[PDB]
Amino acid sequence: KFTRSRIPEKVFQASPEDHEKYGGDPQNPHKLHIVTRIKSTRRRPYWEKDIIKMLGLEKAHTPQVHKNIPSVNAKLKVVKHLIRIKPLKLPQGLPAEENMSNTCLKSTGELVVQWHLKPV
Amino acid sequence: TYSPLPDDYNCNVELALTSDGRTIVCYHPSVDIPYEHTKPIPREEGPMIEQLSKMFFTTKHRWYPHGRYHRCRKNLNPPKDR
Amino acid sequence: GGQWRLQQGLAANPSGYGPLTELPDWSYADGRPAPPMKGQLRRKAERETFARRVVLLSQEMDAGLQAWQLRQQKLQEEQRKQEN
Amino acid sequence: SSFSRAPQQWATFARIWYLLDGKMQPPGKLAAMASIRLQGLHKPVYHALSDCGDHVVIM
Amino acid sequence: RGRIPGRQWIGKHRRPRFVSLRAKQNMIRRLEIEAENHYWLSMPYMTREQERGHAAVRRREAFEAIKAAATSKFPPHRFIADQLDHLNVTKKWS
């Protein structure tokens, strides 16, 4: 019978080689995930459909910010084959009230708080 | 001596960048044909359709007439652009 | 060629974020700026909501960490007080 | 440019004659070249309804 | 000649299917994306104990808003102006 898959915990224990490859320090982990649905929930189990709806990833290629916490991570583990997860980067820090209207999420995963649309 | 494309046909392309590098300029003056690359000016239904096909390198089918239906369907005042 | 754009940090689709789409499409010949485009207004609203969610999530996680630290304190100094 | 309408149209939709030498050549590659030229797919003004084909002479 | 018995792709004797380099590359690309997903999921920020109850207030307020919306369902108001405006159908000139 086809059932829900229990991912062994060893899969989610990064190695030093993984750290070097993907550029992430085990200490000081990132706070937020940018998650984009890159796969259709069609032809996938209803539980994956429901998890996608819960995470609010109904539209494909639409980034969504999520907490990097154990429960959200469990849901993302359930639907990990349909999504792309990246760490949200804040080169200029968190947006403030003043610059809340000038933000932009660049394809690199950086939320720039000044968007001038002018040459550097 | 490097040229992105041969400059013996059509314009002679010369690419450039502005100092700021935010726009690409292209100087492409047309090339005239050299005088030496020029020559001096020189100084029944079945048989009909076969002759026309041989003349215009087409098949026989197009030279046959069409019916009144198609003839009157054709638009005699087509829209004209430019 | 969206992969090259991604490598350069631009949107994979040139129709995405950038001057080509986010700049005003026109302006009055007098020079007066044109009213904001509907698509640009919607995009700005979406980015504002995204930024506000980012701030909210980060603030909530920071507050949770601070609360957990405070609770661990409470436990530690309590334990010590009833030990003494 | 600066041509009259009819001469310009004639020049644009004129059929050119190309020569292929088949000596020691793969018939498939010869056929690919000939098909492109015959269809006119080598012309920027190409269109299936424009009858923009060209003549190909293979020796 | 060259018949597949019955219906292709379903029976015991199906039409053979072969993976192209294109398909292999596509699958490898998806696998790489998922490996990166594993890496980024392997580094949680808070622990379960640290997260316990850190969104309880917001979640409760959101459900309170939902409950208020559910319980505020009531027939709309009715105005004398709406009823009397129908008399304008026979509004004429002089």
Added chain:
Amino acid sequence: GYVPKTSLSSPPWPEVVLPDPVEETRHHAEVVKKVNEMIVTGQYGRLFAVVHFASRQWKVTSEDLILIGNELDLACGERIRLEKVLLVGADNFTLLGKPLLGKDLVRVEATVIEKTESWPRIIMRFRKRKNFKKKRIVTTPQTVLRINSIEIAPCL
């Protein structure tokens, strides 16, 4: 590391040697100056321009007509500047933006000639043997603009 000349000892394509950066930048400057002097002296006739308007790119020239498939919230006969010009070209030279040309470089002006609704478009949905038949008539707002001028300035 020498390899005797064989059919596969060297790549089939010719070996290209790009110009050295210093001399090539000098040539860049020379060509840019030449084109700038052409613009100053007005050695051009008709100018065409690839301009990004609405959501599309239009190849445009003075006296051209453009049909934008929507209303622009502009009174008819009103003049506008098309600000997203990707390319401006003449008989002898063309200027390309990266990806957009400068305002000080190009000024394309249009006039809102007409505001109209498109001819009725039929949207028909049908599925056999399901009593599934639906019809809708949609008219899309449109604006015809006439491109009055394409002006370039010596700012290269």
Added chain:
Amino acid sequence: MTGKELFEMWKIINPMGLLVEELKKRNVSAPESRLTRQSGGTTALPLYFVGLYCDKKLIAEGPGETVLVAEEEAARVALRKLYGFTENRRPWNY
């Protein structure tokens, strides 16, 4: 006159004669017709690009079905260039 052609508006006969007269007034050697390009000469759909060379310099070239027609069209092109009414001329300033 927008979209109109010089000789569409001003009907002329013997454009070669007009061009010869104009070049004589401008003190330029009489043009020499020269077959720059040709295609399908012996067919029923020939193309002839005939160029007018003065002092071994191309003043204009015109296409045609026959050599005479191509020469006439090249004369028309040369006249347009001399009179400054080329198709790519500066648009009228309104």
Added chain:
Amino acid sequence: LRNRVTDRYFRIQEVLKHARHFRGRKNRCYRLAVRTVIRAFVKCTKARYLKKKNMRTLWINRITAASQEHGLKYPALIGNLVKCQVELNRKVLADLAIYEPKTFKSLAALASRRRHEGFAAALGDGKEPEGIFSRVVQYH
């Protein structure tokens, strides 16, 4: 016959007006004309996707023709123009190929320039100076 339909003429005409240009009895008989007209409207609705697809295919074919005239393949031209950061779309590129042959020659020369710069960079992999046309204008 308390209530009878008196508009059936116009109800039939509303359909037959769109079938007058058909062939055979489909342009006269309502029982057939309605079927043919429904099929025609469905085809018209579905043909907009095909119109866009065929427009792009035609533009690609014409761009391929022009790039082959200039010695380049369509993938090379398009990719290298993108790398040069020129965002001309296929419609405009085909229009340029047809009506501005010298501009298209300039664009093809630029594409080949960028292609050769990329080849040189790959061959001399390292921190060698970036190609003059390979530099990317950053936006912020």
Added chain:
Amino acid sequence: TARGTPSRFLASVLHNGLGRYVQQLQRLSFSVSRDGASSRGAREFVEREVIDFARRNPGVVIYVNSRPCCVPRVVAEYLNGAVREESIHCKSVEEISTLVQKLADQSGLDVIRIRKPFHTDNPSIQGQWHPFTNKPTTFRGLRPREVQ
């Protein structure tokens, strides 16, 4: 459908924008009724909007004819000779205002399929492509395999 309908090319009446914009609409005849629910909106339009529209568009003559009518109408006559008759039957003031403004902003050209979203009288500035463009010339114009 396109094949069952006439078509035209994008065009202007007299190059409407080159020198000056000329409002193509010239006449607007509003047939209205004193009585009849169908023309209530038309009556309100005549009372509250027609004057403002007339002063906004001084180049359009407006003829408001109040006669017994079951279907109030507006006939728009354009400089080019086109006549467009629209029913304002049971249309509110806002609907009538929008319809009239659309007629004012619209040219007299037929509302049919437009073959091209653009129209250029000078499509080429560098020379329309012909097969001999991008083709090099040979010495003495010798065709291939020619001996002399």
